[PDB]
């Protein structure tokens, strides 16, 4: 499906947001908000600040 990789190390400052390491890439990352994303990091889903993350193509 979809995928993404964190540009830097970020801390999800949200109730429905998860954190992940830069090199730590995740899968199943869809784009709901033009500024925010959502994907599965190590099994669990969450939200990603597009600012510290980038999908893959």
């Amino acid at each position: 499906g979809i995928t993404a990789i964190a540009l830097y190390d970020y801390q999800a400052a949200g109730d429905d947001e998860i954190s992940f390491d830069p090199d730590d890439i995740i899968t199943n990352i869809e784009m709901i908000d033009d500024g925010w994303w959502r994907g599965v990091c190590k099994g669990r889903y969450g939200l990603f600040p597009a600012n510290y993350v980038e999908l893959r193509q």
Binding site: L7, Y8, Y10, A13, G14, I32, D33, G35, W36, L47, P49, A50, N51, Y52
Partner: peptide
């Protein structure tokens, strides 16, 4: 070898109320 500073935070996403 890449160097980049952290970007600003985006506005919280919109979410409708629960059913």
């Amino acid at each position: 070898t890449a160097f980049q500073e952290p970007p600003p935070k985006p506005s919280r996403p919109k979410y409708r109320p629960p059913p």
